[PDB]
Design a protein around this ligand. Structure first.
Ligand code: HEM
Length: 148
């Protein structure tokens, strides 16, 4: 595949400042779906507003965790199945936190938003398509975490 290098090359820019870029992702996420804000429970309390989350060291640590998992997916873009068991457990964890299957689509849109804003003219339709495919594979693995 050639869209693997598309992924690697587009990730390079954002991966140098992962907290700054992940902050865009989460600000976008809460703008689109405010009901995700209460899922964070640090110190047994709920954030009132999205800007409250940005003041929380624990919340910012989670942004770094998110960006590191995406980095693992990019690293293994030609061979994701290697992350399947890890992602299944990560999905199970998030289901327990309260994330629902539908919310992963909003996370996906927030990731694409953050890439679009960072890459500008370099966010080509092929780049969008490559990322949608990679993210979709990640969500498919995480969704194995759920049970029916
Ligand atoms: C609606 C979206 C999300 C919500 C509400 C959410 C919430 C949480 C919460 C409450 C925790 C436990 C506290 C913590 O460790 O900070 C957690 C852990 C974690 N999250 Fe998320 N998260 C979301 C999205 C993501 C995404 C997209 C990723 C990676 C692609 C991710 C990766 C992780 C990791 C690696 C942990 C630590 C898991 C562990 O304990 O082993 N999260 N998340």
């Amino acid at each position: 595949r050639p869209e693997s290098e598309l992924i690697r090359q587009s990730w390079r820019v954002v991966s140098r400042s992962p907290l700054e870029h992940g902050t865009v992702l989460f600000a976008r996420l809460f703008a689109l779906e405010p009901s995700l804000l209460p899922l964070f429970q640090y110190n047994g309390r709920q954030f009132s507003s999205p800007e409250d989350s940005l003041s929380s060291p624990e919340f910012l640590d989670h942004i770094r965790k998110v960006m590191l998992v995406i980095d693992a997916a990019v690293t293994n873009v030609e061979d994701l199945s290697s992350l399947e068991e890890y992602l299944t457990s990560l999905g199970r964890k998030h289901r327990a936190v309260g994330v629902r299957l539908s919310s992963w689509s909003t996370v996906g849109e927030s990731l694409l938003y953050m890439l679009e804003k960072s890459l500008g003219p370099d966010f080509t339709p092929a780049t969008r398509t490559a990322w949608s495919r990679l993210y979709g594979a990640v969500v498919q693995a995480m969704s194995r975490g759920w049970d029916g």
